Design a protein around this motif. Structure first.
Motif, PDB file in Angstrom:
ATOM      1  N   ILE A 178       0.840  -1.192   0.000  1.00 28.59           N
ATOM      2  CA  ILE A 178       0.000   0.000   0.000  1.00 28.59           C
ATOM      3  C   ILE A 178       0.877   1.245   0.000  1.00 28.59           C
ATOM      4  CG2 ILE A 178      -0.204   0.188   2.512  1.00 28.59           C
ATOM      5  CD1 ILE A 178      -2.927   0.882  -0.149  1.00 28.59           C
ATOM      6  N   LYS A 223       0.989  12.035   0.784  1.00 24.90           N
ATOM      7  CA  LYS A 223       1.542  11.075   1.747  1.00 24.90           C
ATOM      8  C   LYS A 223       0.475  10.316   2.542  1.00 24.90           C
ATOM      9  CE  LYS A 223       5.183  12.998   2.683  1.00 24.90           C
ATOM     10  NZ  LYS A 223       6.400  13.535   2.011  1.00 24.90           N
ATOM     11  N   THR A 224      -0.786  10.800   2.522  1.00 24.59           N
ATOM     12  CA  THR A 224      -1.911  10.231   3.265  1.00 24.59           C
ATOM     13  C   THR A 224      -2.819   9.440   2.337  1.00 24.59           C
ATOM     14  OG1 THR A 224      -1.989  11.797   5.102  1.00 24.59           O
ATOM     15  CG2 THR A 224      -4.080  10.829   4.375  1.00 24.59           C
ATOM     16  N   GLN A 246      -8.436   1.609   1.915  1.00 19.51           N
ATOM     17  CA  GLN A 246      -8.749   0.668   2.985  1.00 19.51           C
ATOM     18  C   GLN A 246     -10.006  -0.141   2.702  1.00 19.51           C
ATOM     19  OE1 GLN A 246      -7.274  -0.489   5.502  1.00 19.51           O
ATOM     20  NE2 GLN A 246      -5.773   0.978   6.291  1.00 19.51           N
ATOM     21  N   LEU A 266      -8.258  -3.137   0.436  1.00 19.06           N
ATOM     22  CA  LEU A 266      -7.573  -4.168   1.214  1.00 19.06           C
ATOM     23  C   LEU A 266      -8.558  -5.121   1.874  1.00 19.06           C
ATOM     24  CD1 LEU A 266      -4.757  -3.259   3.838  1.00 19.06           C
ATOM     25  CD2 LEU A 266      -5.463  -5.545   3.115  1.00 19.06           C
ATOM     26  N   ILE A 275       1.858  -7.553   5.340  1.00 15.43           N
ATOM     27  CA  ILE A 275       1.479  -6.201   4.922  1.00 15.43           C
ATOM     28  C   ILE A 275       2.642  -5.239   5.148  1.00 15.43           C
ATOM     29  CG2 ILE A 275      -0.449  -4.571   4.938  1.00 15.43           C
ATOM     30  CD1 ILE A 275      -2.045  -6.486   6.573  1.00 15.43           C
ATOM     31  N   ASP A 314       4.076  -0.920   3.835  1.00  9.82           N
ATOM     32  CA  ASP A 314       3.689   0.378   3.278  1.00  9.82           C
ATOM     33  C   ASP A 314       4.824   0.954   2.432  1.00  9.82           C
ATOM     34  OD1 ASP A 314       2.169   2.846   2.938  1.00  9.82           O
ATOM     35  OD2 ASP A 314       3.543   3.731   4.407  1.00  9.82           O
ATOM     36  N   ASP A 350       7.304   0.442   8.290  1.00 10.28           N
ATOM     37  CA  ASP A 350       6.628   0.577   9.575  1.00 10.28           C
ATOM     38  C   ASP A 350       7.593   0.405  10.743  1.00 10.28           C
ATOM     39  OD1 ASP A 350       5.400  -2.125   7.984  1.00 10.28           O
ATOM     40  OD2 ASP A 350       6.690  -2.492   9.723  1.00 10.28           O
ATOM     41  N   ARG A 395      10.241   3.349  10.756  1.00  7.47           N
ATOM     42  CA  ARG A 395       9.633   4.560  11.297  1.00  7.47           C
ATOM     43  C   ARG A 395       9.219   4.381  12.754  1.00  7.47           C
ATOM     44  NH1 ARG A 395       5.841   4.654   7.643  1.00  7.47           N
ATOM     45  NH2 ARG A 395       6.139   5.345   5.472  1.00  7.47           N
ATOM     46  N   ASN A 434      -3.824   2.381  12.333  1.00  8.56           N
ATOM     47  CA  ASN A 434      -3.835   0.958  12.048  1.00  8.56           C
ATOM     48  C   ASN A 434      -3.848   0.757  10.538  1.00  8.56           C
ATOM     49  OD1 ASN A 434      -3.596  -1.388  13.531  1.00  8.56           O
ATOM     50  ND2 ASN A 434      -5.792  -1.863  13.461  1.00  8.56           N
ATOM     51  N   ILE A 435      -3.066  -0.214  10.062  1.00 12.58           N
ATOM     52  CA  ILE A 435      -2.974  -0.473   8.632  1.00 12.58           C
ATOM     53  C   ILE A 435      -4.310  -0.904   8.026  1.00 12.58           C
ATOM     54  CG2 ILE A 435      -2.386  -2.907   8.747  1.00 12.58           C
ATOM     55  CD1 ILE A 435      -0.823  -0.218   6.479  1.00 12.58           C
ATOM     56  N   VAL A 436      -5.318  -1.169   8.855  1.00 12.22           N
ATOM     57  CA  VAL A 436      -6.554  -1.825   8.430  1.00 12.22           C
ATOM     58  C   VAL A 436      -7.780  -1.008   8.835  1.00 12.22           C
ATOM     59  CG1 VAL A 436      -5.744  -4.186   8.160  1.00 12.22           C
ATOM     60  CG2 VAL A 436      -6.197  -3.284  10.441  1.00 12.22           C
ATOM     61  N   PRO A 451       0.814  -3.958  11.040  1.00  7.55           N
ATOM     62  CA  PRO A 451       1.659  -2.778  10.815  1.00  7.55           C
ATOM     63  C   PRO A 451       0.865  -1.482  10.933  1.00  7.55           C
ATOM     64  CG  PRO A 451       1.109  -3.790   8.728  1.00  7.55           C
ATOM     65  CD  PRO A 451       0.556  -4.702   9.794  1.00  7.55           C
ATOM     66  N   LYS A 452       1.608  -0.375  10.988  1.00  7.47           N
ATOM     67  CA  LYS A 452       1.028   0.953  11.130  1.00  7.47           C
ATOM     68  C   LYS A 452       1.643   1.924  10.129  1.00  7.47           C
ATOM     69  CE  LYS A 452       0.300   0.347  16.109  1.00  7.47           C
ATOM     70  NZ  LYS A 452      -1.184   0.477  16.037  1.00  7.47           N
ATOM     71  N   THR A 453       0.809   2.823   9.606  1.00  9.52           N
ATOM     72  CA  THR A 453       1.290   3.926   8.785  1.00  9.52           C
ATOM     73  C   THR A 453       1.800   5.045   9.685  1.00  9.52           C
ATOM     74  OG1 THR A 453      -0.826   5.116   8.642  1.00  9.52           O
ATOM     75  CG2 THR A 453      -0.483   3.300   7.113  1.00  9.52           C
ATOM     76  N   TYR A 454       2.941   5.627   9.320  1.00  7.31           N
ATOM     77  CA  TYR A 454       3.581   6.671  10.118  1.00  7.31           C
ATOM     78  C   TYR A 454       3.689   7.949   9.295  1.00  7.31           C
ATOM     79  CZ  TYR A 454       4.830   3.263  13.693  1.00  7.31           C
ATOM     80  OH  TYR A 454       4.783   2.308  14.682  1.00  7.31           O
ATOM     81  N   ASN A 455       2.945   8.979   9.691  1.00 11.09           N
ATOM     82  CA  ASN A 455       2.960  10.255   8.993  1.00 11.09           C
ATOM     83  C   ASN A 455       2.912  11.388  10.007  1.00 11.09           C
ATOM     84  OD1 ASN A 455       2.984  12.038   6.794  1.00 11.09           O
ATOM     85  ND2 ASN A 455       0.740  12.169   6.770  1.00 11.09           N
TER      86      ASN A 455
END
Ligand SMILES: NC[C@@H]1O[C@H](O[C@H]2[C@@H](O)[C@H](O[C@@H]3[C@@H](O)[C@H](N)C[C@H](N)[C@H]3O[C@H]3O[C@H](CO)[C@@H](O)[C@H](O)[C@H]3N)O[C@@H]2CO)[C@H](N)[C@@H](O)[C@@H]1O
Ligand SMILES: NC[C@@H]1O[C@H](O[C@H]2[C@@H](O)[C@H](O[C@@H]3[C@@H](O)[C@H](N)C[C@H](N)[C@H]3O[C@H]3O[C@H](CO)[C@@H](O)[C@H](O)[C@H]3N)O[C@@H]2CO)[C@H](N)[C@@H](O)[C@@H]1O
Ligand SMILES: [Mg+2]
Ligand SMILES: [Mg+2]
Ligand SMILES: [Mg+2]
Ligand SMILES: [Mg+2]
Ligand SMILES: [Mg+2]
Ligand SMILES: [Mg+2]
Ligand SMILES: [Mg+2]
Ligand SMILES: [Mg+2]
Ligand SMILES: [Mg+2]
Ligand SMILES: [Mg+2]
Ligand SMILES: [Mg+2]
Ligand SMILES: [Mg+2]
Ligand SMILES: [Mg+2]
Ligand SMILES: [Mg+2]
Ligand SMILES: [Mg+2]
Ligand SMILES: [Mg+2]
Ligand SMILES: [Mg+2]
Ligand SMILES: [Mg+2]
Ligand SMILES: [Mg+2]
Ligand SMILES: [Mg+2]
Ligand SMILES: [Mg+2]
Ligand SMILES: [Mg+2]
Ligand SMILES: [Mg+2]
Ligand SMILES: [Mg+2]
Ligand SMILES: [Mg+2]
Ligand SMILES: [Mg+2]
Ligand SMILES: [Mg+2]
Ligand SMILES: [Mg+2]
Ligand SMILES: [Mg+2]
Ligand SMILES: [Mg+2]
Ligand SMILES: [Mg+2]
Ligand SMILES: [Mg+2]
Ligand SMILES: [Mg+2]
Ligand SMILES: [Mg+2]
Ligand SMILES: [Mg+2]
Ligand SMILES: [Mg+2]
Ligand SMILES: [Mg+2]
Ligand SMILES: [Mg+2]
Ligand SMILES: [Mg+2]
Ligand SMILES: [Mg+2]
Ligand SMILES: [Mg+2]
Ligand SMILES: [Mg+2]
Ligand SMILES: [Mg+2]
Ligand SMILES: [Mg+2]
Ligand SMILES: [Mg+2]
Ligand SMILES: [Mg+2]
Ligand SMILES: [Mg+2]
Ligand SMILES: [Mg+2]
Ligand SMILES: [Zn+2]
Ligand SMILES: [Zn+2]
Lengths: 91, 128, 216, 100, 97, 198, 25
Positions: B74, B83-84, B90, B93, B106, B108, C89, C92, E42-44, E64-68
RNA sequence: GGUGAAAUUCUUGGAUUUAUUGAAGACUAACUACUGCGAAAGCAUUUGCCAAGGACGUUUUCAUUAAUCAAGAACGAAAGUUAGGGGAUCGAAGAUGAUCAGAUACCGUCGUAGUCUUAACCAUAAACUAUGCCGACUAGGGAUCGGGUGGUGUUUUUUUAAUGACCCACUCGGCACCUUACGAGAAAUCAAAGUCUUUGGGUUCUGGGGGGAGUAUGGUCGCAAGGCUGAAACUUAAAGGAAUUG
């Protein structure tokens, strides 16, 4: 004995040709006439004649140069990329 | 274990959703279908129901080509961009569970520069 | 109307033998017929699988490895070690405020004539009874630390080939020498090898390629 | 913490004796009175090898300066420039053993 | 007359901070300014997490997690109510909600 | 004379007989009297050396490069010119390079070229400044100078030569299929006017 | 009108006023 | 592709998406903080070199050598100017697509100069803390950066002794912050913006209702854009600050 104020070497051209042109000449005129550093003997003996060629007045070695100055700026940024891509291939 | 494997790379723009499945090394693609297909909007190309209606029509050929299980990848636009993730990413997925394809591992892939090129919009901003 | 997949020949992917689980999955290729056969775009491909999948021990879950296909033999393709990423992930997640982030790398050529530049990432932690809110390290700490991070990063990649480091990083042998070395300077939570990038490569030779494959 | 070279040379400069330049260095080489010779980076390979061969004969330590003869002459603190330096006595400096 | 003693936000003894671009307007704004709220997801999310953990291989797995880290200019941050207007002494409090 | 790009005279020893053989090379800016030029596929990568084109890594810059093997050089001979190798091929001994005009051209990896960019620097930066300076410029080249304007001649001498005011009178852009004697002005011109195209 | 634009406005006035005065040689 | 919706435009010469390899130019993420450094402007990848600076430590040295400054000088964001180098991105002018009664715009696609560099100019910014420099004096409070002193405090090895990191107490020197008003102020507020009608430690700069106006003129500097210097006639009862209630 300050002589000129702006023109300097291009006082020879008198009132003729226009400022910017006269002014642009003085730049390169001073470049080509300048004495430069011999990369070989290590004196400021490098003089020009015949644009593109530069010699040492003592050690007598002649370097293919720029037209009005010894190093084409873009050509040194060549020697780098040549040296760089050589060191990649021979390492 | 078995589970013939593929790599499903999902890219969610705020203006559209990309659903793309390939083999392991990314060369040969299996199928790729996006929201801009399954609805007539230009508004809904990113719709959550769009990207869910996407993974559907993928899966028919995914088992048909023989990819039983798939990884998942993803990313948002990234680089100098938002970036978002987008709206449908979602809802894609998850819709991959309505297939029967077996998900795993999974991660990113959103491109994140080291401090890149100048941003669009010009300083004093995007003003409305 | 047409369907490329009719005519698609399927292949089986063999990992290196410096790992544990060697069955990756079934890649596909277009057919081998006249005019540009199917050993053309198979051979050069590059795969990435999780180190938890290769070793079977999920303790490696956050380490991706690039595996370059080298030779294709009898409907069975063989690969080698290309590069190693950290995914995202996890990388970061290790980045937290109120502390020093350290980065390092060095270029080193190996004995099998693989020129490599391999990256290390560290941090710093509060220790025990510390009331100090943040973890920061003095710059004249971060200097000689990153130095010996690379000095350790050199002598390990330098002394041996790629086949040894393929198995040297799996236990994370190198990381432990960094906590063994830099113990004396700063606490330094979370030492790793984040990335190794394969720059220069020898050609073919199938004696280090078959020092890999045929056994699994 | 580290003496580079020119600190070591500055001490050689006023502690013990020295001579400067090709001719005089050849003398010292022919008399075995030379502990060390420093050769500027830009000196011609003819002189470089003629000095290298002259020196290996009498077994004198050889050091190649990292700079041209222009910076070397100021590295001995002289105002002119010099292509080669011969060290007749180390005096209160070292250079002979340390790291070279 | 001076509204704040941070004036917009904290510099206090530097000459500059290399400004940052907004994640919404693209509007430029000093890093010392520019509301930044780290956002992990949350990735989901949703109820996806259930039938996703169902559909997956691996035992129980892990998520996993998205980091922004999003940077916001005032004009946008207020409109999008990442931040709101406070009172004369309400503005004073720097404690995070 | 009449060339603004100094020449380098390189001696060689005749492989097949005991004699000296002198060559005329275009000096590459940093080539210098006394240096040793190395020539061949096994030769190193250094300024002044002539190499096959496939034998350099892409990004390499080169001059006097042959369009086909062994024609002894065509492209980028002028003062201050170079051509950058942009890629190679497994098939058919092909490099591909970007020429000073900017158009990329795919030639034989066996074709040669000398490593560097020709001397003679920025020669055209300096304004001619005088009629006489342009006079001696072409005295040593060819007699194209000075140039009388066709719009200034009589109709007998030039299509432009219509008088009573000074004007061309019909489109100054001529076709390609035009006939010898009609072709003057902008010849194949795709478009015309001030561009500002970087 | 905006402070800044009054500035630009007279900066144009001083140019035209220099130019007209120039015709007096 | 793109927006609120669209259109512009890209496309079965396979567009967006996928992979392998390569090239150029910029930028230096996250870490990044009411933290650092510098006279400011400013400065954020590694290592080397070249010199520099503070604070601290000090039972060294000199012994009034200093403080602040008209003149004069060094440096001085950004845009901008003259030349070459460069030109990835973004992007004045502009070209357009949309938008509106109109829309020379805001929004969208493209894009010249510019942006990057080298040499040379330019010397202006809300160049702001809108707050001169030096010295003394008057009040509590915790965080923190650097240095030093005392910790027969602590933790990781194989003297569980040794260079470290952590804790604790003290003390200079920093970037800030909090509470109190001792005071001060038109107030907003202020550890200075206090020690002011109980009016003087030293010193530099500026201001004197609003306009006219940073205009006119002269001079001077600049290639130019411009900078520096800088009036008067005339006009006008308000202009303005802070706070209050609406
Ligand atoms: N002065 C050095 C440089 O000269 C060049 O400027 C010159 C040229 O670019 C421009 O075109 C001249 C053309 O007018 C003149 N009649 C002939 C000349 N060959 C042309 O030059 C043109 O063609 C040559 C190939 O011929 C190309 O390599 C070049 O890129 C192109 N500009 O005319 C300019 C002078 O009138 C650079 N473009 C410029 O940036 C710079 O001034
Ligand atoms: N110029 C600094 C001065 O510090 C003084 O003293 C301060 C400190 O020097 C003193 O030490 C404190 C200690 O009390 C408190 N219980 C723990 C705190 N860590 C200590 O501070 C110490 O460690 C920190 C880092 O942790 C360092 O940044 C600091 O330099 C050091 N002194 O405690 C005070 C803070 O509570 C006064 N606060 C004041 O005169 C002024 O702020
Ligand atoms: Mg070289
Ligand atoms: Mg859309
Ligand atoms: Mg569509
Ligand atoms: Mg449609
Ligand atoms: Mg608005
Ligand atoms: Mg030391
Ligand atoms: Mg010392
Ligand atoms: Mg000689
Ligand atoms: Mg600020
Ligand atoms: Mg500022
Ligand atoms: Mg004639
Ligand atoms: Mg003409
Ligand atoms: Mg003519
Ligand atoms: Mg006539
Ligand atoms: Mg006719
Ligand atoms: Mg006519
Ligand atoms: Mg006529
Ligand atoms: Mg007539
Ligand atoms: Mg006419
Ligand atoms: Mg005419
Ligand atoms: Mg006609
Ligand atoms: Mg003003
Ligand atoms: Mg007059
Ligand atoms: Mg429409
Ligand atoms: Mg395609
Ligand atoms: Mg960084
Ligand atoms: Mg002054
Ligand atoms: Mg500037
Ligand atoms: Mg500029
Ligand atoms: Mg102009
Ligand atoms: Mg160019
Ligand atoms: Mg753009
Ligand atoms: Mg416009
Ligand atoms: Mg109307
Ligand atoms: Mg109306
Ligand atoms: Mg109209
Ligand atoms: Mg109309
Ligand atoms: Mg626009
Ligand atoms: Mg132009
Ligand atoms: Mg001012
Ligand atoms: Mg301010
Ligand atoms: Mg001011
Ligand atoms: Mg301390
Ligand atoms: Mg009185
Ligand atoms: Mg007044
Ligand atoms: Mg003015
Ligand atoms: Mg004036
Ligand atoms: Mg008011
Ligand atoms: Zn010489
Ligand atoms: Zn914004």
């Amino acid at each position: 004995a300050k002589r000129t104020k702006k023109v300097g070497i291009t006082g020879k051209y008198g009132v003729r040709y226009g400022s910017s042109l006269r002014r642009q000449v003085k730049k390169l005129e001073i470049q080509q006439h300048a004495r430069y550093d011999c990369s070989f003997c290590g004196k400021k003996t490098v003089k020009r004649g015949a644009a593109g060629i530069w010699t040492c007045s003592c050690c007598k070695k002649t370097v293919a140069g720029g037209a009005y100055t010894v190093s084409t700026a873009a050509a040194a940024t060549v020697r780098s990329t040549i040296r760089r891509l050589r060191e990649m291939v021979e390492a | 274990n078995s589970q013939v494997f593929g790599v499903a790379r999902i890219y969610a723009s705020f203006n559209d959703t990309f659903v793309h499945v390939t083999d392991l090394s990314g060369k040969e693609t299996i199928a790729r279908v996006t929201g801009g297909m399954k609805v007539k909007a230009d508004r809904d190309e990113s719709s959550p129901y769009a990207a869910m209606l996407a993974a559907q029509d993928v899966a028919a050929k995914c088992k048909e080509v023989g990819i039983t299980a798939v990884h998942v990848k993803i990313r948002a636009t990234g680089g100098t961009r938002t970036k978002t993730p987008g709206p449908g990413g979602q809802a894609a997925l998850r819709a991959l569970a309505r297939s029967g394809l077996r998900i795993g591992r999974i991660e990113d892939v959103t491109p994140v520069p080291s401090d890149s090129t100048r941003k669009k919009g010009g300083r004093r901003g995007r003003r409305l | 109307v047409v369907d490329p997949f009719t005519r698609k020949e399927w292949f089986d992917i063999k990992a290196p033998s410096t790992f544990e689980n060697r069955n990756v999955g079934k890649t596909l290729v277009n057919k081998s017929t006249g005019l540009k056969s199917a050993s053309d775009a198979l051979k050069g491909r590059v795969v990435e699988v999780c180190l938890a999948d290769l070793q079977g021990s999920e303790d490696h879950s956050f380490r991706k490895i690039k595996l370059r296909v080298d030779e294709v033999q009898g409907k069975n393709l063989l690969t080698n070690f290309h590069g190693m990423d950290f995914t995202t992930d996890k990388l970061r997640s290790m980045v937290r405020k109120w502390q020093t982030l350290i980065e390092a790398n060095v270029t080193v050529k190996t004995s099998d004539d693989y020129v490599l530049r391999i990256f290390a990432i560290a941090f710093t932690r509060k220790q025990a009874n510390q009331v100090k809110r943040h973890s920061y390290a003095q710059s004249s700490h971060i200097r000689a630390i990153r130095k010996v991070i690379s000095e350790i990063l050199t002598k390990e990649v330098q002394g041996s080939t790629l086949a040894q480091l393929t198995s040297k990083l799996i236990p994370e042998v190198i990381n432990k020498e960094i906590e063994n070395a830099t113990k004396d300077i700063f606490p330094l939570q979370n030492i790793h090898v984040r990335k190794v990038k394969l720059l220069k490569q020898p050609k073919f030779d199938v004696g280090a390629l078959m020092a890999l494959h045929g056994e699994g | 913490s580290q003496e580079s070279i020119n600190q070591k040379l500055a001490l050689v400069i006023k502690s013990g004796k020295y001579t400067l330049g090709y001719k005089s260095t050849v003398k010292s080489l022919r008399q075995g009175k030379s502990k060390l010779i420093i050769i500027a980076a830009n000196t011609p390979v003819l002189r470089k090898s003629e000095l290298e061969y002259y020196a290996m004969l009498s077994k004198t330590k050889v050091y190649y300066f990292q700079g041209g003869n222009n910076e070397l002459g100021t590295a001995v603190g002289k105002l002119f420039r010099v292509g080669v330096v011969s060290i007749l006595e180390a005096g209160d400096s070292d250079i002979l053993t340390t790291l070279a | 007359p001076k509204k704040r003693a941070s004036n917009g936000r904290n510099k206090k003894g530097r000459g500059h901070v290399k400004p940052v671009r907004c994640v919404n307007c693209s509007k430029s704004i000093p890093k010392d300014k520019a509301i930044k709220r780290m956002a992990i997801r949350n990735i989901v999310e949703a109820a996806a997490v259930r039938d996703l953990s169902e559909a997956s291989v691996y035992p129980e797995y892990a998520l996993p997690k998205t980091y922004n880290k999003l940077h916001y200019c005032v004009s946008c941050a207020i409109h999008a109510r990442i931040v709101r207007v406070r009172s004369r002494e309400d503005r004073k409090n720097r404690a995070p909600p | 004379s009449g060339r603004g790009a100094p020449l380098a005279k390189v001696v060689f020893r005749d492989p097949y007989k005991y004699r000296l053989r002198e060559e005329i090379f275009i000096a590459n800016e940093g080539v210098h009297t006394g240096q040793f030029i190395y020539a061949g596929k096994k030769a190193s990568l250094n300024v002044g050396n002539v190499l096959p084109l496939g034998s350099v890594p892409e990004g390499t810059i080169v001059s006097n490069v042959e369009e086909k093997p062994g024609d002894r050089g065509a492209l980028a001979r002028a003062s201050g010119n170079y051509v950058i190798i942009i890629g190679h091929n497994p098939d058919e001994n092909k490099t591909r390079v970007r020429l000073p005009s900017g158009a990329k051209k795919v030639i034989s990896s066996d074709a040669r070229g000398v490593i560097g960019v020709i001397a003679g620097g920025g020669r055209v930066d300096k304004p001619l400044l005088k009629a006489g300076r342009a006079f001696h410029k072409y005295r040593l080249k060819r007699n194209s100078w000075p140039k009388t304007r066709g719009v200034a001649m009589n109709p007998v001498d030039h299509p432009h030569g219509g008088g009573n005011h000074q004007h061309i009178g019909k489109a100054s852009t001529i076709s390609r299929g035009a006939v010898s004697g009609q072709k003057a002005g902008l010849i194949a011109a795709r478009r015309t006017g001030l561009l500002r195209g970087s | 009108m905006r402070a800044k634009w009054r500035k630009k406005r007279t900066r144009r006035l001083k140019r035209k006023r220099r130019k007209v005065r120039a015709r007096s040689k």
